[PDB]
Amino acid sequence: PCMAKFGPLPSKWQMASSEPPCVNKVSDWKLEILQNGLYLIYGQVAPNAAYNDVAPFEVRLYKNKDMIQTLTNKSKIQNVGGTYELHVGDTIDLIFNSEHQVLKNNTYWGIILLAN
Amino acid sequence: PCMAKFGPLPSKWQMASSEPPCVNKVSDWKLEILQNGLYLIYGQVAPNAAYNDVAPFEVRLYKNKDMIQTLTNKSKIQNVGGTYELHVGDTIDLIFNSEHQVLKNNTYWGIILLAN
Amino acid sequence: PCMAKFGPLPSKWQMASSEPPCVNKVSDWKLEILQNGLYLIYGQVAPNAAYNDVAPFEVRLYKNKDMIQTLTNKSKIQNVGGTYELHVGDTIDLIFNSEHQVLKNNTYWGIILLAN
Protein backbone atom coordinates (compact mmCIF):
# COMPACT_ATOMS: atom_id res chain seq x y z
CA PRO A 1 0.00 0.00 0.00
CA CYS A 2 0.81 3.67 0.02
CA MET A 3 -0.49 5.44 3.09
CA ALA A 4 0.54 8.20 5.47
CA LYS A 5 -1.19 9.84 8.41
CA PHE A 6 -0.47 12.91 10.51
CA GLY A 7 -1.47 12.79 14.16
CA PRO A 8 -2.65 12.46 16.63
CA LEU A 9 -0.26 13.08 19.55
CA PRO A 10 1.98 11.56 20.73
CA SER A 11 2.62 10.93 17.02
CA LYS A 12 3.24 13.14 14.02
CA TRP A 13 3.71 12.12 10.39
CA GLN A 14 4.00 8.38 9.90
CA MET A 15 4.36 6.66 6.51
CA ALA A 16 4.03 3.32 4.73
CA SER A 17 4.89 2.75 1.07
CA SER A 18 6.96 0.88 -1.40
CA GLU A 19 9.78 2.50 -3.35
CA PRO A 20 9.32 5.06 -4.66
CA PRO A 21 7.06 6.67 -2.15
CA CYS A 22 3.81 8.05 -3.59
CA VAL A 23 3.68 10.96 -1.13
CA ASN A 24 6.02 12.86 1.17
CA LYS A 25 5.85 14.86 4.39
CA VAL A 26 6.33 18.58 3.87
CA SER A 27 5.66 19.60 7.47
CA ASP A 28 3.13 19.16 10.30
CA TRP A 29 -0.30 18.44 8.81
CA LYS A 30 1.07 19.13 5.37
CA LEU A 31 1.96 16.54 2.73
CA GLU A 32 3.10 16.47 -0.90
CA ILE A 33 1.87 14.18 -3.72
CA LEU A 34 4.56 12.44 -5.78
CA GLN A 35 2.42 9.97 -7.72
CA ASN A 36 -0.71 10.70 -9.76
CA GLY A 37 -3.71 8.61 -8.68
CA LEU A 38 -6.88 7.86 -6.78
CA TYR A 39 -6.55 8.85 -3.12
CA LEU A 40 -8.96 8.47 -0.28
CA ILE A 41 -8.23 11.08 2.34
CA TYR A 42 -9.73 10.53 5.75
CA GLY A 43 -9.44 11.82 9.27
CA GLN A 44 -11.47 13.42 12.02
CA VAL A 45 -11.50 16.71 13.87
CA ALA A 46 -12.61 16.55 17.48
CA PRO A 47 -13.25 20.17 18.58
CA ASN A 48 -11.86 21.17 21.94
CA ALA A 49 -14.49 21.56 24.64
CA ALA A 50 -13.11 24.50 26.63
CA TYR A 51 -12.04 26.74 23.70
CA ASN A 52 -12.65 30.37 24.52
CA ASP A 53 -10.66 32.81 22.44
CA VAL A 54 -11.99 35.41 20.06
CA ALA A 55 -11.20 33.68 16.77
CA PRO A 56 -14.23 31.93 15.21
CA PHE A 57 -14.17 28.15 14.92
CA GLU A 58 -13.23 26.88 11.47
CA VAL A 59 -10.90 24.13 10.27
CA ARG A 60 -9.85 24.11 6.60
CA LEU A 61 -8.54 21.33 4.38
CA TYR A 62 -6.51 22.60 1.44
CA LYS A 63 -5.57 20.96 -1.82
CA ASN A 64 -2.54 23.05 -2.52
CA LYS A 65 -3.73 26.64 -2.23
CA ASP A 66 -7.42 25.81 -2.60
CA MET A 67 -9.79 25.01 0.20
CA ILE A 68 -11.31 21.65 -0.52
CA GLN A 69 -13.11 21.37 2.82
CA THR A 70 -14.40 23.50 5.70
CA LEU A 71 -15.28 22.43 9.18
CA THR A 72 -17.63 24.80 10.92
CA ASN A 73 -19.55 22.67 13.40
CA LYS A 74 -17.78 23.13 16.76
CA SER A 75 -19.53 20.38 18.74
CA LYS A 76 -19.50 17.36 16.43
CA ILE A 77 -16.30 15.45 16.09
CA GLN A 78 -16.28 15.77 12.31
CA ASN A 79 -14.94 13.64 9.50
CA VAL A 80 -12.45 15.05 7.03
CA GLY A 81 -11.44 13.64 3.68
CA GLY A 82 -13.01 12.26 0.54
CA THR A 83 -12.03 10.51 -2.69
CA TYR A 84 -9.63 12.60 -4.73
CA GLU A 85 -7.65 12.09 -7.85
CA LEU A 86 -4.50 14.05 -7.12
CA HIS A 87 -1.44 14.89 -9.20
CA VAL A 88 2.27 15.25 -8.69
CA GLY A 89 3.33 18.34 -6.76
CA ASP A 90 -0.10 18.49 -5.17
CA THR A 91 -0.09 19.47 -1.52
CA ILE A 92 -2.71 18.83 1.17
CA ASP A 93 -3.17 20.77 4.37
CA LEU A 94 -5.31 20.79 7.49
CA ILE A 95 -5.36 24.32 8.96
CA PHE A 96 -7.07 25.11 12.27
CA ASN A 97 -8.12 28.73 12.97
CA SER A 98 -6.65 28.78 16.46
CA GLU A 99 -4.35 25.98 17.53
CA HIS A 100 -6.39 25.55 20.68
CA GLN A 101 -9.65 25.10 18.75
CA VAL A 102 -8.93 21.40 18.53
CA LEU A 103 -8.11 18.37 20.63
CA LYS A 104 -4.79 17.27 19.20
CA ASN A 105 -4.68 14.25 21.47
CA ASN A 106 -7.54 13.11 19.25
CA THR A 107 -7.51 14.94 15.86
CA TYR A 108 -5.66 13.92 12.70
CA TRP A 109 -5.97 12.89 9.05
CA GLY A 110 -4.50 10.56 6.52
CA ILE A 111 -4.30 9.31 3.00
CA ILE A 112 -4.33 6.11 1.02
CA LEU A 113 -3.56 5.50 -2.63
CA LEU A 114 -6.37 3.43 -4.14
CA ALA A 115 -5.24 3.16 -7.77
CA ASN A 116 -3.68 4.50 -11.03
CA PRO B 1 -11.00 -9.03 1.69
CA CYS B 2 -12.78 -8.33 4.93
CA MET B 3 -16.36 -7.27 4.42
CA ALA B 4 -19.76 -7.71 6.04
CA LYS B 5 -23.18 -6.29 5.29
CA PHE B 6 -26.49 -6.26 7.14
CA GLY B 7 -29.64 -6.34 5.05
CA PRO B 8 -31.67 -6.04 3.20
CA LEU B 9 -34.44 -8.66 3.56
CA PRO B 10 -34.65 -11.53 2.90
CA SER B 11 -31.09 -11.41 4.27
CA LYS B 12 -29.53 -10.35 7.55
CA TRP B 13 -25.86 -10.25 8.50
CA GLN B 14 -23.59 -11.83 5.91
CA MET B 15 -19.78 -11.96 6.16
CA ALA B 16 -16.61 -12.51 4.15
CA SER B 17 -13.11 -12.57 5.64
CA SER B 18 -9.97 -14.51 6.17
CA GLU B 19 -8.97 -15.89 9.56
CA PRO B 20 -9.10 -14.17 11.90
CA PRO B 21 -12.15 -12.17 11.06
CA CYS B 22 -11.68 -8.39 11.24
CA VAL B 23 -15.26 -7.76 12.42
CA ASN B 24 -18.11 -9.68 14.02
CA LYS B 25 -21.90 -9.57 14.15
CA VAL B 26 -23.25 -8.42 17.49
CA SER B 27 -26.91 -8.34 16.47
CA ASP B 28 -29.25 -6.99 13.76
CA TRP B 29 -27.71 -3.85 12.25
CA LYS B 30 -25.00 -3.92 14.87
CA LEU B 31 -21.40 -5.05 14.37
CA GLU B 32 -18.17 -5.17 16.37
CA ILE B 33 -14.63 -4.26 15.20
CA LEU B 34 -11.90 -6.81 15.94
CA GLN B 35 -9.07 -5.37 13.85
CA ASN B 36 -7.76 -1.80 13.84
CA GLY B 37 -7.78 -0.23 10.36
CA LEU B 38 -9.17 1.82 7.51
CA TYR B 39 -12.83 0.99 6.91
CA LEU B 40 -15.20 2.26 4.29
CA ILE B 41 -18.74 1.97 5.57
CA TYR B 42 -21.49 2.23 3.01
CA GLY B 43 -25.18 1.58 2.67
CA GLN B 44 -28.43 3.31 1.83
CA VAL B 45 -31.65 4.14 3.60
CA ALA B 46 -34.75 4.16 1.45
CA PRO B 47 -37.50 5.85 3.52
CA ASN B 48 -40.87 4.16 3.53
CA ALA B 49 -43.51 5.96 1.48
CA ALA B 50 -46.63 5.38 3.58
CA TYR B 51 -45.14 6.03 7.06
CA ASN B 52 -47.65 7.78 9.26
CA ASP B 53 -46.97 7.48 12.96
CA VAL B 54 -46.21 10.27 15.38
CA ALA B 55 -42.47 9.72 15.78
CA PRO B 56 -40.36 12.13 13.68
CA PHE B 57 -38.25 10.68 10.87
CA GLU B 58 -34.59 10.22 11.77
CA VAL B 59 -32.12 7.40 11.20
CA ARG B 60 -28.88 7.38 13.21
CA LEU B 61 -25.54 5.70 12.57
CA TYR B 62 -23.54 5.13 15.74
CA LYS B 63 -19.86 4.49 16.27
CA ASN B 64 -20.17 2.78 19.58
CA LYS B 65 -22.22 5.15 21.72
CA ASP B 66 -21.61 8.19 19.53
CA MET B 67 -23.74 9.29 16.64
CA ILE B 68 -21.52 9.51 13.61
CA GLN B 69 -24.35 10.16 11.16
CA THR B 70 -27.95 11.40 11.02
CA LEU B 71 -30.49 10.90 8.31
CA THR B 72 -33.24 13.46 8.35
CA ASN B 73 -34.43 13.71 4.75
CA LYS B 74 -37.52 11.48 4.51
CA SER B 75 -37.97 11.46 0.72
CA LYS B 76 -34.47 10.85 -0.65
CA ILE B 77 -33.13 7.36 -0.53
CA GLN B 78 -29.99 8.41 1.32
CA ASN B 79 -26.45 7.11 1.47
CA VAL B 80 -24.91 6.07 4.75
CA GLY B 81 -21.27 5.46 5.53
CA GLY B 82 -17.90 7.12 5.04
CA THR B 83 -14.20 6.38 5.49
CA TYR B 84 -13.37 5.58 9.09
CA GLU B 85 -10.33 4.42 10.92
CA LEU B 86 -11.82 2.19 13.59
CA HIS B 87 -10.32 0.33 16.53
CA VAL B 88 -10.81 -2.95 18.31
CA GLY B 89 -13.97 -3.18 20.40
CA ASP B 90 -15.54 -0.48 18.27
CA THR B 91 -19.21 -1.03 17.50
CA ILE B 92 -21.32 0.37 14.66
CA ASP B 93 -25.08 0.72 14.62
CA LEU B 94 -27.87 1.84 12.33
CA ILE B 95 -30.89 2.88 14.44
CA PHE B 96 -34.21 3.87 12.89
CA ASN B 97 -36.63 6.03 14.93
CA SER B 98 -39.65 3.86 14.18
CA GLU B 99 -39.13 0.47 12.60
CA HIS B 100 -41.74 1.33 10.00
CA GLN B 101 -39.94 4.52 8.96
CA VAL B 102 -37.92 2.51 6.49
CA LEU B 103 -38.24 0.08 3.62
CA LYS B 104 -36.34 -2.93 4.89
CA ASN B 105 -36.84 -4.77 1.62
CA ASN B 106 -34.45 -2.12 0.35
CA THR B 107 -32.38 -0.58 3.23
CA TYR B 108 -29.06 -1.81 4.61
CA TRP B 109 -25.40 -1.03 5.20
CA GLY B 110 -22.00 -2.59 5.12
CA ILE B 111 -18.31 -2.37 5.72
CA ILE B 112 -15.03 -3.09 4.04
CA LEU B 113 -11.52 -3.08 5.46
CA LEU B 114 -9.28 -1.01 3.17
CA ALA B 115 -5.94 -1.21 5.02
CA ASN B 116 -3.71 -1.25 8.15
CA PRO C 1 -8.42 -3.20 -11.15
CA CYS C 2 -11.64 -2.17 -12.78
CA MET C 3 -11.84 1.55 -13.39
CA ALA C 4 -13.16 3.98 -15.98
CA LYS C 5 -13.31 7.76 -16.13
CA PHE C 6 -15.04 10.24 -18.41
CA GLY C 7 -13.29 13.53 -19.05
CA PRO C 8 -11.89 15.91 -18.97
CA LEU C 9 -11.02 17.26 -22.45
CA PRO C 10 -9.05 16.50 -24.51
CA SER C 11 -10.18 13.05 -23.34
CA LYS C 12 -13.50 11.25 -23.18
CA TRP C 13 -14.25 7.79 -21.81
CA GLN C 14 -11.15 5.81 -20.91
CA MET C 15 -11.18 2.32 -19.36
CA ALA C 16 -9.05 -0.19 -17.48
CA SER C 17 -10.19 -3.69 -16.55
CA SER C 18 -9.60 -7.36 -16.84
CA GLU C 19 -11.85 -9.64 -18.88
CA PRO C 20 -14.73 -9.45 -18.58
CA PRO C 21 -15.09 -5.75 -18.07
CA CYS C 22 -17.08 -4.76 -14.97
CA VAL C 23 -18.53 -1.64 -16.63
CA ASN C 24 -19.09 -0.25 -20.12
CA LYS C 25 -19.38 3.12 -21.83
CA VAL C 26 -22.90 3.92 -22.97
CA SER C 27 -22.17 7.45 -24.16
CA ASP C 28 -20.56 10.73 -23.04
CA TRP C 29 -20.73 10.97 -19.24
CA LYS C 30 -22.87 7.88 -19.15
CA LEU C 31 -21.76 4.38 -18.17
CA GLU C 32 -23.34 0.95 -17.61
CA ILE C 33 -22.65 -1.53 -14.78
CA LEU C 34 -21.96 -5.13 -15.82
CA GLN C 35 -20.74 -6.56 -12.51
CA ASN C 36 -22.43 -6.34 -9.11
CA GLY C 37 -20.18 -4.83 -6.43
CA LEU C 38 -18.74 -2.09 -4.27
CA TYR C 39 -17.93 0.99 -6.35
CA LEU C 40 -16.36 4.24 -5.35
CA ILE C 41 -17.44 6.95 -7.75
CA TYR C 42 -15.43 10.13 -7.74
CA GLY C 43 -14.95 13.24 -9.80
CA GLN C 44 -15.17 17.00 -9.59
CA VAL C 45 -17.23 19.73 -11.17
CA ALA C 46 -15.47 23.03 -11.68
CA PRO C 47 -18.19 25.61 -12.50
CA ASN C 48 -17.48 27.94 -15.38
CA ALA C 49 -16.67 31.49 -14.33
CA ALA C 50 -18.32 33.51 -17.10
CA TYR C 51 -21.62 31.56 -17.37
CA ASN C 52 -24.48 33.90 -18.09
CA ASP C 53 -27.54 32.25 -19.56
CA VAL C 54 -30.98 32.05 -18.06
CA ALA C 55 -30.94 28.42 -16.92
CA PRO C 56 -30.21 28.02 -13.19
CA PHE C 57 -26.99 26.29 -12.17
CA GLU C 58 -27.42 22.64 -11.22
CA VAL C 59 -25.46 19.50 -12.04
CA ARG C 60 -27.09 16.11 -11.42
CA LEU C 61 -25.60 12.66 -10.92
CA TYR C 62 -28.02 9.86 -11.78
CA LYS C 63 -28.04 6.22 -10.80
CA ASN C 64 -30.10 5.00 -13.67
CA LYS C 65 -33.19 7.20 -13.67
CA ASP C 66 -32.75 8.39 -10.09
CA MET C 67 -30.84 11.43 -9.00
CA ILE C 68 -28.24 10.31 -6.52
CA GLN C 69 -26.51 13.69 -6.29
CA THR C 70 -27.12 17.40 -6.92
CA LEU C 71 -24.59 20.14 -7.34
CA THR C 72 -25.98 23.56 -6.63
CA ASN C 73 -23.01 25.62 -5.46
CA LYS C 74 -21.81 27.55 -8.53
CA SER C 75 -18.52 28.90 -7.15
CA LYS C 76 -16.90 25.90 -5.45
CA ILE C 77 -15.26 23.33 -7.60
CA GLN C 78 -17.28 20.49 -6.11
CA ASN C 79 -16.65 16.81 -5.56
CA VAL C 80 -18.95 14.21 -7.05
CA GLY C 81 -19.20 10.55 -6.17
CA GLY C 82 -19.48 8.33 -3.12
CA THR C 83 -19.38 4.65 -2.18
CA TYR C 84 -22.10 2.70 -3.94
CA GLU C 85 -23.02 -0.91 -4.22
CA LEU C 86 -24.31 -1.12 -7.77
CA HIS C 87 -25.91 -3.92 -9.77
CA VAL C 88 -25.87 -5.20 -13.31
CA GLY C 89 -27.69 -3.01 -15.82
CA ASP C 90 -27.21 -0.03 -13.54
CA THR C 91 -26.39 3.20 -15.33
CA ILE C 92 -24.67 6.33 -14.02
CA ASP C 93 -24.93 9.81 -15.46
CA LEU C 94 -23.58 13.30 -14.90
CA ILE C 95 -26.03 15.84 -16.37
CA PHE C 96 -25.27 19.56 -16.48
CA ASN C 97 -28.19 22.03 -16.76
CA SER C 98 -26.58 24.05 -19.53
CA GLU C 99 -23.53 22.68 -21.28
CA HIS C 100 -21.77 25.98 -20.71
CA GLN C 101 -22.37 25.89 -16.96
CA VAL C 102 -19.16 23.94 -16.55
CA LEU C 103 -15.47 24.00 -17.39
CA LYS C 104 -15.05 20.83 -19.40
CA ASN C 105 -11.32 21.38 -19.69
CA ASN C 106 -11.43 20.61 -15.98
CA THR C 107 -14.62 18.65 -15.04
CA TYR C 108 -15.11 14.88 -15.06
CA TRP C 109 -15.88 11.78 -13.00
CA GLY C 110 -14.93 8.18 -12.63
CA ILE C 111 -15.43 4.85 -11.00
CA ILE C 112 -13.51 2.08 -9.35
CA LEU C 113 -14.63 -1.39 -8.32
CA LEU C 114 -13.58 -1.99 -4.72
CA ALA C 115 -14.98 -5.49 -4.10
CA ASN C 116 -17.61 -8.28 -4.43
Coordinates of C-alpha atoms in Angstrom, one line a residue:
Chain A
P1 CA 0.0 0.0 0.0
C2 CA 0.8 3.7 0.0
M3 CA -0.5 5.4 3.1
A4 CA 0.5 8.2 5.5
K5 CA -1.2 9.8 8.4
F6 CA -0.5 12.9 10.5
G7 CA -1.5 12.8 14.2
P8 CA -2.7 12.5 16.6
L9 CA -0.3 13.1 19.5
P10 CA 2.0 11.6 20.7
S11 CA 2.6 10.9 17.0
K12 CA 3.2 13.1 14.0
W13 CA 3.7 12.1 10.4
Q14 CA 4.0 8.4 9.9
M15 CA 4.4 6.7 6.5
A16 CA 4.0 3.3 4.7
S17 CA 4.9 2.7 1.1
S18 CA 7.0 0.9 -1.4
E19 CA 9.8 2.5 -3.4
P20 CA 9.3 5.1 -4.7
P21 CA 7.1 6.7 -2.1
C22 CA 3.8 8.0 -3.6
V23 CA 3.7 11.0 -1.1
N24 CA 6.0 12.9 1.2
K25 CA 5.8 14.9 4.4
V26 CA 6.3 18.6 3.9
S27 CA 5.7 19.6 7.5
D28 CA 3.1 19.2 10.3
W29 CA -0.3 18.4 8.8
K30 CA 1.1 19.1 5.4
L31 CA 2.0 16.5 2.7
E32 CA 3.1 16.5 -0.9
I33 CA 1.9 14.2 -3.7
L34 CA 4.6 12.4 -5.8
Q35 CA 2.4 10.0 -7.7
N36 CA -0.7 10.7 -9.8
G37 CA -3.7 8.6 -8.7
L38 CA -6.9 7.9 -6.8
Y39 CA -6.5 8.9 -3.1
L40 CA -9.0 8.5 -0.3
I41 CA -8.2 11.1 2.3
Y42 CA -9.7 10.5 5.7
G43 CA -9.4 11.8 9.3
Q44 CA -11.5 13.4 12.0
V45 CA -11.5 16.7 13.9
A46 CA -12.6 16.6 17.5
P47 CA -13.3 20.2 18.6
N48 CA -11.9 21.2 21.9
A49 CA -14.5 21.6 24.6
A50 CA -13.1 24.5 26.6
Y51 CA -12.0 26.7 23.7
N52 CA -12.7 30.4 24.5
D53 CA -10.7 32.8 22.4
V54 CA -12.0 35.4 20.1
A55 CA -11.2 33.7 16.8
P56 CA -14.2 31.9 15.2
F57 CA -14.2 28.1 14.9
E58 CA -13.2 26.9 11.5
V59 CA -10.9 24.1 10.3
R60 CA -9.8 24.1 6.6
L61 CA -8.5 21.3 4.4
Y62 CA -6.5 22.6 1.4
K63 CA -5.6 21.0 -1.8
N64 CA -2.5 23.0 -2.5
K65 CA -3.7 26.6 -2.2
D66 CA -7.4 25.8 -2.6
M67 CA -9.8 25.0 0.2
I68 CA -11.3 21.6 -0.5
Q69 CA -13.1 21.4 2.8
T70 CA -14.4 23.5 5.7
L71 CA -15.3 22.4 9.2
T72 CA -17.6 24.8 10.9
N73 CA -19.6 22.7 13.4
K74 CA -17.8 23.1 16.8
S75 CA -19.5 20.4 18.7
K76 CA -19.5 17.4 16.4
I77 CA -16.3 15.4 16.1
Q78 CA -16.3 15.8 12.3
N79 CA -14.9 13.6 9.5
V80 CA -12.4 15.1 7.0
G81 CA -11.4 13.6 3.7
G82 CA -13.0 12.3 0.5
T83 CA -12.0 10.5 -2.7
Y84 CA -9.6 12.6 -4.7
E85 CA -7.7 12.1 -7.9
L86 CA -4.5 14.1 -7.1
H87 CA -1.4 14.9 -9.2
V88 CA 2.3 15.2 -8.7
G89 CA 3.3 18.3 -6.8
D90 CA -0.1 18.5 -5.2
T91 CA -0.1 19.5 -1.5
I92 CA -2.7 18.8 1.2
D93 CA -3.2 20.8 4.4
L94 CA -5.3 20.8 7.5
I95 CA -5.4 24.3 9.0
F96 CA -7.1 25.1 12.3
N97 CA -8.1 28.7 13.0
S98 CA -6.6 28.8 16.5
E99 CA -4.3 26.0 17.5
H100 CA -6.4 25.6 20.7
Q101 CA -9.6 25.1 18.7
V102 CA -8.9 21.4 18.5
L103 CA -8.1 18.4 20.6
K104 CA -4.8 17.3 19.2
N105 CA -4.7 14.2 21.5
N106 CA -7.5 13.1 19.3
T107 CA -7.5 14.9 15.9
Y108 CA -5.7 13.9 12.7
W109 CA -6.0 12.9 9.1
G110 CA -4.5 10.6 6.5
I111 CA -4.3 9.3 3.0
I112 CA -4.3 6.1 1.0
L113 CA -3.6 5.5 -2.6
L114 CA -6.4 3.4 -4.1
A115 CA -5.2 3.2 -7.8
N116 CA -3.7 4.5 -11.0
Chain B
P1 CA -11.0 -9.0 1.7
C2 CA -12.8 -8.3 4.9
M3 CA -16.4 -7.3 4.4
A4 CA -19.8 -7.7 6.0
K5 CA -23.2 -6.3 5.3
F6 CA -26.5 -6.3 7.1
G7 CA -29.6 -6.3 5.0
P8 CA -31.7 -6.0 3.2
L9 CA -34.4 -8.7 3.6
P10 CA -34.6 -11.5 2.9
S11 CA -31.1 -11.4 4.3
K12 CA -29.5 -10.4 7.5
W13 CA -25.9 -10.2 8.5
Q14 CA -23.6 -11.8 5.9
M15 CA -19.8 -12.0 6.2
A16 CA -16.6 -12.5 4.1
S17 CA -13.1 -12.6 5.6
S18 CA -10.0 -14.5 6.2
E19 CA -9.0 -15.9 9.6
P20 CA -9.1 -14.2 11.9
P21 CA -12.2 -12.2 11.1
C22 CA -11.7 -8.4 11.2
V23 CA -15.3 -7.8 12.4
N24 CA -18.1 -9.7 14.0
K25 CA -21.9 -9.6 14.2
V26 CA -23.2 -8.4 17.5
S27 CA -26.9 -8.3 16.5
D28 CA -29.2 -7.0 13.8
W29 CA -27.7 -3.8 12.3
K30 CA -25.0 -3.9 14.9
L31 CA -21.4 -5.1 14.4
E32 CA -18.2 -5.2 16.4
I33 CA -14.6 -4.3 15.2
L34 CA -11.9 -6.8 15.9
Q35 CA -9.1 -5.4 13.8
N36 CA -7.8 -1.8 13.8
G37 CA -7.8 -0.2 10.4
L38 CA -9.2 1.8 7.5
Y39 CA -12.8 1.0 6.9
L40 CA -15.2 2.3 4.3
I41 CA -18.7 2.0 5.6
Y42 CA -21.5 2.2 3.0
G43 CA -25.2 1.6 2.7
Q44 CA -28.4 3.3 1.8
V45 CA -31.6 4.1 3.6
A46 CA -34.8 4.2 1.5
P47 CA -37.5 5.9 3.5
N48 CA -40.9 4.2 3.5
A49 CA -43.5 6.0 1.5
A50 CA -46.6 5.4 3.6
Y51 CA -45.1 6.0 7.1
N52 CA -47.6 7.8 9.3
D53 CA -47.0 7.5 13.0
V54 CA -46.2 10.3 15.4
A55 CA -42.5 9.7 15.8
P56 CA -40.4 12.1 13.7
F57 CA -38.3 10.7 10.9
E58 CA -34.6 10.2 11.8
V59 CA -32.1 7.4 11.2
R60 CA -28.9 7.4 13.2
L61 CA -25.5 5.7 12.6
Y62 CA -23.5 5.1 15.7
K63 CA -19.9 4.5 16.3
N64 CA -20.2 2.8 19.6
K65 CA -22.2 5.1 21.7
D66 CA -21.6 8.2 19.5
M67 CA -23.7 9.3 16.6
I68 CA -21.5 9.5 13.6
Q69 CA -24.4 10.2 11.2
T70 CA -28.0 11.4 11.0
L71 CA -30.5 10.9 8.3
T72 CA -33.2 13.5 8.4
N73 CA -34.4 13.7 4.8
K74 CA -37.5 11.5 4.5
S75 CA -38.0 11.5 0.7
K76 CA -34.5 10.8 -0.6
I77 CA -33.1 7.4 -0.5
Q78 CA -30.0 8.4 1.3
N79 CA -26.5 7.1 1.5
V80 CA -24.9 6.1 4.8
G81 CA -21.3 5.5 5.5
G82 CA -17.9 7.1 5.0
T83 CA -14.2 6.4 5.5
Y84 CA -13.4 5.6 9.1
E85 CA -10.3 4.4 10.9
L86 CA -11.8 2.2 13.6
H87 CA -10.3 0.3 16.5
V88 CA -10.8 -3.0 18.3
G89 CA -14.0 -3.2 20.4
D90 CA -15.5 -0.5 18.3
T91 CA -19.2 -1.0 17.5
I92 CA -21.3 0.4 14.7
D93 CA -25.1 0.7 14.6
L94 CA -27.9 1.8 12.3
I95 CA -30.9 2.9 14.4
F96 CA -34.2 3.9 12.9
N97 CA -36.6 6.0 14.9
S98 CA -39.6 3.9 14.2
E99 CA -39.1 0.5 12.6
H100 CA -41.7 1.3 10.0
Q101 CA -39.9 4.5 9.0
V102 CA -37.9 2.5 6.5
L103 CA -38.2 0.1 3.6
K104 CA -36.3 -2.9 4.9
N105 CA -36.8 -4.8 1.6
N106 CA -34.4 -2.1 0.4
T107 CA -32.4 -0.6 3.2
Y108 CA -29.1 -1.8 4.6
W109 CA -25.4 -1.0 5.2
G110 CA -22.0 -2.6 5.1
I111 CA -18.3 -2.4 5.7
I112 CA -15.0 -3.1 4.0
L113 CA -11.5 -3.1 5.5
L114 CA -9.3 -1.0 3.2
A115 CA -5.9 -1.2 5.0
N116 CA -3.7 -1.2 8.2
Chain C
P1 CA -8.4 -3.2 -11.1
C2 CA -11.6 -2.2 -12.8
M3 CA -11.8 1.6 -13.4
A4 CA -13.2 4.0 -16.0
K5 CA -13.3 7.8 -16.1
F6 CA -15.0 10.2 -18.4
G7 CA -13.3 13.5 -19.0
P8 CA -11.9 15.9 -19.0
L9 CA -11.0 17.3 -22.4
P10 CA -9.0 16.5 -24.5
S11 CA -10.2 13.0 -23.3
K12 CA -13.5 11.3 -23.2
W13 CA -14.3 7.8 -21.8
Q14 CA -11.2 5.8 -20.9
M15 CA -11.2 2.3 -19.4
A16 CA -9.0 -0.2 -17.5
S17 CA -10.2 -3.7 -16.5
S18 CA -9.6 -7.4 -16.8
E19 CA -11.8 -9.6 -18.9
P20 CA -14.7 -9.4 -18.6
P21 CA -15.1 -5.8 -18.1
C22 CA -17.1 -4.8 -15.0
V23 CA -18.5 -1.6 -16.6
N24 CA -19.1 -0.3 -20.1
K25 CA -19.4 3.1 -21.8
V26 CA -22.9 3.9 -23.0
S27 CA -22.2 7.5 -24.2
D28 CA -20.6 10.7 -23.0
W29 CA -20.7 11.0 -19.2
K30 CA -22.9 7.9 -19.2
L31 CA -21.8 4.4 -18.2
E32 CA -23.3 1.0 -17.6
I33 CA -22.6 -1.5 -14.8
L34 CA -22.0 -5.1 -15.8
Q35 CA -20.7 -6.6 -12.5
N36 CA -22.4 -6.3 -9.1
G37 CA -20.2 -4.8 -6.4
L38 CA -18.7 -2.1 -4.3
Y39 CA -17.9 1.0 -6.4
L40 CA -16.4 4.2 -5.4
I41 CA -17.4 6.9 -7.7
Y42 CA -15.4 10.1 -7.7
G43 CA -14.9 13.2 -9.8
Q44 CA -15.2 17.0 -9.6
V45 CA -17.2 19.7 -11.2
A46 CA -15.5 23.0 -11.7
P47 CA -18.2 25.6 -12.5
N48 CA -17.5 27.9 -15.4
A49 CA -16.7 31.5 -14.3
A50 CA -18.3 33.5 -17.1
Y51 CA -21.6 31.6 -17.4
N52 CA -24.5 33.9 -18.1
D53 CA -27.5 32.3 -19.6
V54 CA -31.0 32.1 -18.1
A55 CA -30.9 28.4 -16.9
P56 CA -30.2 28.0 -13.2
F57 CA -27.0 26.3 -12.2
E58 CA -27.4 22.6 -11.2
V59 CA -25.5 19.5 -12.0
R60 CA -27.1 16.1 -11.4
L61 CA -25.6 12.7 -10.9
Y62 CA -28.0 9.9 -11.8
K63 CA -28.0 6.2 -10.8
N64 CA -30.1 5.0 -13.7
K65 CA -33.2 7.2 -13.7
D66 CA -32.8 8.4 -10.1
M67 CA -30.8 11.4 -9.0
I68 CA -28.2 10.3 -6.5
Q69 CA -26.5 13.7 -6.3
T70 CA -27.1 17.4 -6.9
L71 CA -24.6 20.1 -7.3
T72 CA -26.0 23.6 -6.6
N73 CA -23.0 25.6 -5.5
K74 CA -21.8 27.6 -8.5
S75 CA -18.5 28.9 -7.2
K76 CA -16.9 25.9 -5.4
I77 CA -15.3 23.3 -7.6
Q78 CA -17.3 20.5 -6.1
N79 CA -16.6 16.8 -5.6
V80 CA -18.9 14.2 -7.0
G81 CA -19.2 10.6 -6.2
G82 CA -19.5 8.3 -3.1
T83 CA -19.4 4.7 -2.2
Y84 CA -22.1 2.7 -3.9
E85 CA -23.0 -0.9 -4.2
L86 CA -24.3 -1.1 -7.8
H87 CA -25.9 -3.9 -9.8
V88 CA -25.9 -5.2 -13.3
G89 CA -27.7 -3.0 -15.8
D90 CA -27.2 0.0 -13.5
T91 CA -26.4 3.2 -15.3
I92 CA -24.7 6.3 -14.0
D93 CA -24.9 9.8 -15.5
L94 CA -23.6 13.3 -14.9
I95 CA -26.0 15.8 -16.4
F96 CA -25.3 19.6 -16.5
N97 CA -28.2 22.0 -16.8
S98 CA -26.6 24.1 -19.5
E99 CA -23.5 22.7 -21.3
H100 CA -21.8 26.0 -20.7
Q101 CA -22.4 25.9 -17.0
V102 CA -19.2 23.9 -16.6
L103 CA -15.5 24.0 -17.4
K104 CA -15.0 20.8 -19.4
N105 CA -11.3 21.4 -19.7
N106 CA -11.4 20.6 -16.0
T107 CA -14.6 18.7 -15.0
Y108 CA -15.1 14.9 -15.1
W109 CA -15.9 11.8 -13.0
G110 CA -14.9 8.2 -12.6
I111 CA -15.4 4.9 -11.0
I112 CA -13.5 2.1 -9.3
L113 CA -14.6 -1.4 -8.3
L114 CA -13.6 -2.0 -4.7
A115 CA -15.0 -5.5 -4.1
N116 CA -17.6 -8.3 -4.4

